Nucleic acid binder design. Structure first.
Ligand code: ZN
Ligand code: ZN
Lengths: 63, 129, 184, 81, 42, 28, 147, 25, 19, 33, 150
RNA sequence: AAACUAUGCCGACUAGGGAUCGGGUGGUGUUUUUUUA
């Protein structure tokens, strides 16, 4: 189980690794990634430039 | 002087969207520009557009709401096979299922998903996400 | 003067309108000579979907220039002759196909005889004597074209009762669905 | 004027604008029928002419060219179209 | 020393091709002609 | 204001009416 | 509301009756609250067309100068409506006189996107393309609060 | 015909105005 | 505004007047 | 005034972006293909 | 942007939407063609011919009142010039500035302006040699200029 | 003989505001003047 932060989301967009694919490739096991509400609010508060990163974060496998 | 008619059109759409207007005036038109706008409109990035004929080469007024992030054009139109279509989507778009790469196939001008469905390929005009 | 007015086209409706031509000539003082050097080729009577009817006269181009010189009161008189009709003068123009990759020695196609120029001349002729002021093509989100022809507002009541007839006859001539409009 | 459309701009603004920056560019000039008193004779004159239009029958100067619009000479009865 | 008249201008490459007269020939004809000029220079 | 001081016939057009190009059926 | 405003029924799988002034598409509808048989629809050639259903016909059309995104009737008066409109304004029309607006609400810096009435028939909310929400009263013609 | 439709729509407008005027009262 | 050297026939007559 | 203009996130990590659009070199074409 | 200078001026003629004669035009195409031929025999350029036809005789645009343009009608009736009018006038200006320099050998400004005029002449002559209205050996020089414009 | 306290983020760029220089269109009256410039 792995907590995600906003800088992790942003640099993952900028270096092109899908969250679940690359995370599975790193640990070689299955990974449940979790976004907390304050992290989602940091992304929404970052706002209109980083909205594509928000829309990557709102994913049905990111519990 | 002028970059290209297609580059100027897609550039003006980017700039007017990001500034935050509702309709853009594009001059001059082209069949490539009409088809590109039709593809973006079918996939729901722009609103709807109207072709003004004035005997020189028409203008286009496009109503666009908010859904565009970037639309562009690749300048050297290189060649692709289908594995290359997958690799180029993975390297151009922000993620795997996010946005469409717009090709010119022997079957017309259409995006990479419909090209993979129809099982053709060709060259690559631009991209929109 | 039935065969003297027609040009290799025996049809009874053409004979009726040619007899009408003789009536206007031998009842008119000057219009007899004003239409005497003018024949025509063909006639057609086509209905609109609403039930009304229009006559379309296929005419060659120099006598068409003559008809444009003499048209409006002749259209009035032919309307009085065929009450409950719509009078139409048009040109039987020649299209030229695109020469294929394996095609013998034909002449390189004039852009006047390219297809779309024929249709635009057809628009101008059909709408005549009121002029076209613009053309719009609106593309709706289901992928639905809309072709729109903006006319003038000088002959406004003279043309305001002709629009559905014009739509029907142009669609029946070319195979396009088009919409006229008069910006008040 | 504060905010206006692009497809359907009102005839006020489409007359206030330039002649090239309008929606479909068309000319601002027009044509005149003048009647010269030298023969009471009618001539068709461009309203932005550049040459001293002289009547055909009488050598009478109808209009003189001045920059943008031609000035018509005094005592020359004109009307548009 | 000063002269009021300007010197001439160097001609462009297409201008040199037209001066040679090559510019209006077909591909094979310009190929054999280019071979001919290279041989005669050689 | 300047155009009103120098022009002869300008009408005052109300703010509830500056935005109507026109109706189909007219009123008495 | 599409390219032609169709009237359907829940039982019948087919469009029961079409209405259209002309061949101009239609982007927003609203049935009114009281005297339920009156419909109104905006139109992409910047127009507002009222329809009546108990005579099954469009009835009147006013062509404005900017396209109108969204309209709404009020529930306590049954012949007044508001149109949120792209020249940054909301307008408060009567249904009888469509030659003047009873009000024009005037505080947005971008295109007004939607408008809705309070059910008391007293106040109005307009949310616009500009990233905010104005609340007005139906007496003033200027904003009361911004969210 | 179309001007018959135009006159028809004018008549329907007068009818609608009458009903809505009851609501005015 | 009578450009006497503009046209081909006029320069042909110019060649004639040289001859 | 002293702080720097904050840039958004850089997606299309293949070619240069000019007024003419994206310019992609043959090196990168061969690298990805 | 108005080359060999800096200015960004937009000042030209509109062209109306309509592609047919105006309704007030009651003159025959054969008559105006004869008028054009008479003006060419009188010795005007195509541009001044169109200027006279829209000033005096009310011909709005020759291309729309008759199917062919003015220079096309002149070439049809044998009134073809030897070099087109813009190259003719550019060479005329080159002769003008060169003679002014000859009388006044101190005008470095006229030297620079002659350089620019020569550049425009070279561009236009190269295009005309490309389209092959001019012979491929047509060289511009001072003797050709003097003997062609005098 | 020169230089000697100057220093403004940039750009493929959105709306503008007061000025003013050159040209044109329209309205409008004052200053002007009138068959001779
Ligand atoms: Zn938290
Ligand atoms: Zn006279």
């Amino acid at each position: 189980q792995v907590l995600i932060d906003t800088n992790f989301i942003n640099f993952s967009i900028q270096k092109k690794v899908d969250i679940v694919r690359g995370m599975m490739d790193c640990l070689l096991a299955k990974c449940n990634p979790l976004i907390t509400d304050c992290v989602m609010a940091e992304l929404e508060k970052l706002g209109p430039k980083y909205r594509i990163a928000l829309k990557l974060a709102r994913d049905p496998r990111i519990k | 002087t002028r970059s290209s008619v297609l580059a100027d059109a897609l550039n003006a759409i980017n700039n007017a969207e990001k500034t935050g207007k509702r309709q853009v005036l594009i001059r001059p038109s082209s069949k490539v520009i009409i088809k590109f706008l039709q593809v973006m409109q079918k996939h729901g990035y722009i609103g709807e557009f109207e072709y003004i004929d004035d005997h020189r080469s028409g203008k286009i007024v496009v109503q666009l709401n908010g859904r565009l992030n970037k639309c562009g054009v690749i300048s050297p139109r290189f060649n692709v096979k289908i594995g290359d279509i997958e690799k180029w989507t993975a390297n151009l778009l922000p993620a795997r299922q996010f946005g469409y790469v717009i090709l010119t196939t022997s079957a017309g001008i259409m995006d990479h998903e419909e090209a993979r469905r129809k099982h053709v390929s060709g060259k690559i005009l631009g991209f929109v996400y | 003067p039935q065969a003297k007015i027609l040009s290799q086209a025996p049809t009874e409706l053409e004979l009726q309108v040619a007899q009408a031509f003789v009536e206007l000539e031998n009842s008119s003082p000057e219009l007899k000579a004003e239409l005497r050097p003018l024949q025509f080729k063909s006639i057609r009577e086509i209905d609109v979907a609403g039930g009304k009817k229009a006559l379309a006269i296929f005419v060659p181009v120099p006598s068409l220039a003559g008809f444009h010189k003499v048209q409006t009161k002749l259209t009035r008189e032919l309307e009085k002759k065929f009450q409950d009709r719509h009078v139409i003068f048009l040109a039987e123009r020649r299209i030229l196909p695109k020469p294929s990759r394996t095609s013998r020695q034909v002449q390189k196609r004039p852009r006047s005889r390219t297809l779309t120029a024929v249709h635009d001349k057809i628009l101008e002729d059909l709408v005549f004597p009121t002029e076209i002021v613009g053309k719009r093509v609106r593309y709706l989100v289901g992928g639905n074209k809309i072709q729109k022809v903006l006319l003038d507002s000088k002959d406004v009541q003279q043309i305001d009762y002709k629009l559905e007839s014009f739509q029907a006859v142009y669609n029946k001539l070319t195979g396009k669905q088009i919409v006229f409009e008069i910006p008040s | 004027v504060l905010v206006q459309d692009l497809l359907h701009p009102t005839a006020a603004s489409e007359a206030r604008k330039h002649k090239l920056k309008t929606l479909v560019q068309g000319p601002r000039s027009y044509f005149l029928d003048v009647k010269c008193p030298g023969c009471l004779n009618i001539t068709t004159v461009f309203s932005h002419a550049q040459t001293a239009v002289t009547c055909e029958s009488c050598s009478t100067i109808l209009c003189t060219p001045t920059g943008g619009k031609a000035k018509l000479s005094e005592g020359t009865s004109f009307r548009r179209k | 020393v000063y002269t009021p008249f300007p010197p001439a201008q160097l001609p462009r490459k297409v201008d040199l091709e037209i001066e040679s007269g090559e510019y209006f020939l077909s591909k094979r004809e310009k190929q054999m002609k280019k071979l001919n000029e290279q041989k005669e220079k050689q | 204001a300047n155009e009103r001081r120098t022009r002869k016939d300008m009408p005052y057009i109300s703010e509830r009416k500056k935005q109507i190009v026109g109706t189909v059926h007219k009123y008495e | 509301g599409g390219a032609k405003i169709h009237l359907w029924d829940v039982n019948r799988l087919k469009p029961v009756s079409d209405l259209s002034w002309g061949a101009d598409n239609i982007t927003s509808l609203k049935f009114n609250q009281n005297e339920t048989d009156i419909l109104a629809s905006t139109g992409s050639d910047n127009s507002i067309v009222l329809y009546d259903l108990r005579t099954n016909s469009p009835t009147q059309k006013i062509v404005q100068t900017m396209r109108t995104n969204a309209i709404c009737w009020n529930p306590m008066e049954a012949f007044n409506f508001v149109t949120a409109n792209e020249d940054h304004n909301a307008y408060y029309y009567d249904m009888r006189n469509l030659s003047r607006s009873l009000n024009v609400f005037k505080d947005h810096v971008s295109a007004v996107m939607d408008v809705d009435f309070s059910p008391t028939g007293d106040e109005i909310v307009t949310g616009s393309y500009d990233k905010s929400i104005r609340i007005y009263k139906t007496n003033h013609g200027h904003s009361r609060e911004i969210y | 015909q179309r001007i018959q439709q135009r006159h028809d729509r004018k008549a329907a407008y007068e009818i609608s105005r009458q009903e809505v005027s009851k609501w005015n009262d | 505004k009578a450009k006497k050297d503009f046209y081909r026939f006029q320069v042909r007559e110019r060649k004639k007047q040289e001859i | 005034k002293a702080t720097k203009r904050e840039r958004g996130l850089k997606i299309s990590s293949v070619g240069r972006s000019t007024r003419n659009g994206l310019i992609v070199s043959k090196r990168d074409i061969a690298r990805i293909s | 942007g108005r080359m060999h200078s800096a200015g960004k001026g937009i000042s030209s003629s509109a062209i109306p939407y309509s592609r047919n004669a105006p309704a007030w035009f009651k003159l025959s195409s054969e008559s105006v063609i004869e008028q054009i031929v008479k003006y060419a025999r009188k010795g005007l350029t195509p541009s001044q011919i169109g200027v006279l036809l829209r000033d005096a005789h009310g011909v709005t645009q020759a291309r729309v009142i008759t199917g062919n343009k003015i220079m096309r009608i002149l070439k049809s009736n044998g009134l073809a010039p030897e070099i087109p009018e813009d190259l003719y006038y550019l060479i005329k200006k080159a002769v003008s500035v060169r003679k002014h320099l000859e009388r006044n050998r101190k005008d470095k400004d006229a030297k620079f302006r002659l350089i620019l005029i020569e550049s425009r002449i070279h561009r236009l002559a190269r295009y005309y040699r490309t389209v092959a209205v001019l012979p491929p050996n047509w060289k511009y020089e001072s003797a050709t200029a003097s003997a062609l414009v005098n």
